[PDB]
Design a protein around this ligand. Structure first.
Ligand SMILES: [Fe+3]
Ligand SMILES: [Fe+3]
Lengths: 669, 669
């Protein structure tokens, strides 16, 4: 049976269902394809529409999943949606009361319309089926664990009814044993803390990264008025919601004002981070500990968005409550779509359980074959030199050992937030100064951010203190201690408390990446690399050849390795664009705006030129009259060189700024 | 002692404190000036910035109040704000967590900055004082009643703590005896109902207008699951707030979807309106009845926004619980600003109580003197003919009796939502077809809307069944029955149940308007007129000469009476604008926008031209390339005739559309 699982809102490519549709309303849109129980293809819409954690309907994800799996629309037996229909339709109705001119169409109709318009794919209404949100999460987590018995815990932001649901397995089935209502959400608590630290939706892992620098005791007393642990795994949490969240009143009362975007981080900020992280662990371990003791289960499969807290995951491993713990690479909403697919297949009669443990998150589209790639690379030759060594792994280990920081792109893209050796930025794990270098210089972000190591399965025990409890480390789900005698050596990837978010790579999972790490260690003595996501500040992980080339050229990475090829910039900045086109993204908007900005009596209006990305939280940039004129010609087909506009260094430098911001698409003819 | 009272948010003229600042966040911004306890000047910011129920800081209102009262900034002893400081600062902090780049400035600083920037008025921080929201409401309502003892009830949307507060007077002081928390808000319930009917914030009185057409029994069973009345004046109301309001789930469950803007009203819609109104009355009378019986008080002073429900007010009169009832012309937040002023004066030592009953809501700016007006009118002569009869009241009664519908503007503008004979549209109350005519034709709105009569104090008992309980009818606060033997006669102002929102005008309140109504009755036999607000669909009540002339000329009113002058259009449409200027409002935005709207590979972007008003819920209009070009010259100074652009009928008709929409300011040189 072939099932398509979906999550996300219903918005088209170009405009949203409502103006500035809340970013909480079905974020991390994705599609999964499940064939006889096996996840055969999976990718998040963000990788394709280039909008971080997008809520847009995942049309592109569907197209690519089908092609990646060698399936056609007609092969799909059913479509599974990650939330119940009456809940989703309740949300739409709410929206419609707030926006009187938006037509009252419900989710079923709207989903099918998207399939029809974007994919030319019409189906009978009853192809669509809907599933409880927590069950979707839980089925995904449990089935992908391969475990024959497990305590299965889902902790997130919010389902239709609960923030947290506890299940025990019963062979192929799940028995729900407990839940905690939406107001007790750890996900929502962590997000509030993240917003207080001057961040937004999606930035939770940054707070988790800052927390080790802080002292949880500075604000312990204040935090103790925000929650309590009760008997038998019960807890209370300060009730979110209202004109003013009660938490806001309390913080302001104690003299804590929220950090602004781009301000430095004080010790006070780090302390607050530590308090948010500590509080989250206290409650999560209170719940998990109680239910582990009560059920006597020693296998845990943990999911929902809170399972992306790898520090918490580490605490789970060291508690000694379990013998084995599994966390899915996509424990956020994108992963629950495949859980919906599993539920729907089961309801339809399919019996696939049990399945092998998921070991490989590389389920997105690949880069095409190497022949077509070589051809594409020739089209980029005004900007880059291309070489094809006898052995790409051999060449790459040498690049790494000589001290180069590289883009590394091959095979199918990683499903879930973590790069794992298919769309990675790589460098030596040893030099401590690589933290500043990859951050401040290459990615352009905050310096405090820690980096994650990858080690081979063969060498893991030589660098890390792996706990007695067996975690599955294929997806960087867990924090572990670096061996004390290796902390100095592993300068770029050891946090201030001696910890690291570790990727333990096996040959089976990723032979090329495993061989790379193996060879690097033969050359240097140390089979460990730094592995961070391949993206600048303005984009999600790169997906296509176009994305990879753009990202390489608009950051200051030393060199790009894509499939069999080594690619290096020919100049410092990619300014020779004569034979390149400029195009708009669906969300690009270019304006000449007039406004009378004087005080007193009205006077002559002033002209501004501006480009912006018309999605929730979309960036914006002032541009010159000359840039405006140029971009009126951004048709995605005409070469820049033959627009009869003089391509000055000034104009091209301005264009480069916009390319770096991803406001436009720059590609060869 | 001279106190300035303020309400509203802190936004500048041109942009809001945050993007798309919620319209609930301090709406109906206003300023009041209280001198030795007497309201000497009062006006809402909306009348000046031309934005309905604006949340913008009331800079213009302050300027005009000062000038209207013959005061300078330096004369003001203190500034009073209608909410507590810690509540307002809590709201800002909330906002700042949601918007990381907005600087964390608190209300005191931000208010004083507005005074400094907009008015050139600097003061020491401690000039500003803040007051509990319900006490502000209650002091305003009670003091303006002139009552020596009263039950004082405040029912609104939300204060900092309660939706409803009950007080009994103690001479000049108020003793709080009871409150109901914010989740029990009648104001919020009524707004939700209003949104379900395809309306928005501010439209509550439209729902109240529709309710008599409906049958409250159709949905009685459904509605009974939304609330209950308990012992001793207690009640429960369905808890608002959450992902989905529980009320939304219930409505959708029973097959009730929200009406879209501009759709026709079915019997089902009218029934729903009747249910919302009935429910509101059931609860309000449950609370008021209990407290009237418990306190034994037979004088009621009723305030807060729910006191603008004139149907409810009528039910209060007929209950027989009271001997006298007073409702302020501005019972919404604009009126509470003067309550804050009264509290602050009392705290500072002033003892003004008791004061005479408020009888006159005409406290805004006047139209200047008649000499300057005659001069201004000459400047409009390309568009209008101006005549100056010996006796304006005599001429006007004749216009009315001959069947003309008129604009009528004189003296100081009305404070609060109701026009009362200073900025009114007037017509014969007798012809039933005037309902369709003033609505569908002149104002451009829904046909169902009822119209309100004005009668003289001398004649009130001849047309209306005034209840035994004495209501103060100076401000159209109460609904009463039209005498059965006059319902047929008073065709334009009698609702389907025989009721009307009546204005009983005295000579003292408005001598000119009283004389007009008196003379009209001498001419026709019937001293009753239709009296509706002077505004089209796209604006609040007209304020200035410019506003009045614009409104007259951009609607299809027959004739304008302004002060001593009769003004008539020279052509059907005001197209001779050669000697007129065009200007932007502070919120006007004119754009040439590009976007690639194709599907498939990117292609050439498309150009759109558009003008919009950059405030929350601001209108927007597509315009032609030719209109765009023209408006680039809208400097508010250069005459249209000498721009060297050909003023075709087509272009001028398009301009007229925009003028009617208030997207631009059109005025003589
Ligand atoms: Fe989820
Ligand atoms: Fe209020």
């Amino acid at each position: 049976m072939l099932i398509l699982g979906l999550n996300g809102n219903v918005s088209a490519a170009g405009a949203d269902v409502v103006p500035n549709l809340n970013e909480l309303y079905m974020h991390d849109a994705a599609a999964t394809l499940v064939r006889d129980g096996v996840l055969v293809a999976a990718v998040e819409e963000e990788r394709l529409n280039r909008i971080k954690k997008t809520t847009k309907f995942p049309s592109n994800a569907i197209r690519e999943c089908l092609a990646a799996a060698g399936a056609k629309p007609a092969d799909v037996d059913a479509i599974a949606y990650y939330f119940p229909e009456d809940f989703f339709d309740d949300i739409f109705q709410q929206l419609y009361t707030e926006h009187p001119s938006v037509p009252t169409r419900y989710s079923r109709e709207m989903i099918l319309e998207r399939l029809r318009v974007d994919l030319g794919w019409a189906a009978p209404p009853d192809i669509l089926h809907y599933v409880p949100h927590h069950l979707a999460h839980a089925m995904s987590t449990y089935y992908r664990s391969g475990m024959r018995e497990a305590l299965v815990v889902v902790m997130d932001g919010a389902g239709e009814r609960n923030c947290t649901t506890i299940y025990r397995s019963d062979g192929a089935e799940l028995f729900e044993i407990a839940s905690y209502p939406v107001p007790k959400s750890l996900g929502m608590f962590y997000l509030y803390g993240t917003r207080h630290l001057g961040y937004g939706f999606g930035d939770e892992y940054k707070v988790m990264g800052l927390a080790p620098y802080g002292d949880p005791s500075t604000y312990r007393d204040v935090f103790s008025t925000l929650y309590s642990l009760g008997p038998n795994g019960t807890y209370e949490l300060i009730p979110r919601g209202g004109v003013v969240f009660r938490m806001t009143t309390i913080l302001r009362e104690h003299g804590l004002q929220p950090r602004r975007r781009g301000e430095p981080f004080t010790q006070a900020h780090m302390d607050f981070a530590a308090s948010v992280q500590e509080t989250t662990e206290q409650i999560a371990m209170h719940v998990i500990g109680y239910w582990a003791r009560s059920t006597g289960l020693r296998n845990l499969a943990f999911g929902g968005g809170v399972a992306h807290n790898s520090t918490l995951n580490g605490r789970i491993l060291t508690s000694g409550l379990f013998d084995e713990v599994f966390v899915h690479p996509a424990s956020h909403d994108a992963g629950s779509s495949e859980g919906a697919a599993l539920v729907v297949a089961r309801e339809r009669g399919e019996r696939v359980w049990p399945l092998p443990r998921l070991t490989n998150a590389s389920l997105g589209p690949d880069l095409g074959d190497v022949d077509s790639l070589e051809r594409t690379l020739k089209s980029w030759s005004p900007l880059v030199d291309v070489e094809r060594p006898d052995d790409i792994v051999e060449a790459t280990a040498h690049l790494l050992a000589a001290g180069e920081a590289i883009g590394w792109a091959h095979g199918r893209s990683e499903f879930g937030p973590r790069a794992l050796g298919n769309r990675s930025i790589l460098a030596d794990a040893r030099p401590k100064e690589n933290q500043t270098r990859i951050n401040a210089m290459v990615k352009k972000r905050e310096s405090f951010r820690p980096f994650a190591p990858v080690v081979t399965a063969e060498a893991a025990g030589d660098y890390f203190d792996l706990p007695e409890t067996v975690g599955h480390h294929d997806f960087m789900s867990f924090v572990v201690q670096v061996r004390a005698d290796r902390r100095e050596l592993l300068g770029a990837v050891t946090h201030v408390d001696g910890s690291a978010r570790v990727q333990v790579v096996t040959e089976e999972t990723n032979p090329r990446f495993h061989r790379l790490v193996t060879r690097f260690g033969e050359l240097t003595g140390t089979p460990v690399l730094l592995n961070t996501s391949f993206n600048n500040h303005a984009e999600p992980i790169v997906q296509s050849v176009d994305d990879v080339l753009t990202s390489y050229l608009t950051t200051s990475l030393d060199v790009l390795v894509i499939e069999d090829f080594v690619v290096r910039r020919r100049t410092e900045l990619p300014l020779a664009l004569e034979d390149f086109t400029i195009g708009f993204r669906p969300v690009t908007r270019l304006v000449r705006r007039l406004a009378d900005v004087s005080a007193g009596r009205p006077g002559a209006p002033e002209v501004s030129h501006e480009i912006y990305l018309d999605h929730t939280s979309g960036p914006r940039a002032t541009i010159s009259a000359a840039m405006y004129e140029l971009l009126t010609h951004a048709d995605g087909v005409t070469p820049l060189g033959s627009l009869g506009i003089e391509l000055t260094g000034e104009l091209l430098t301005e264009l480069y700024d916009l390319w770096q911001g991803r406001f436009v698409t720059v590609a060869p003819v």
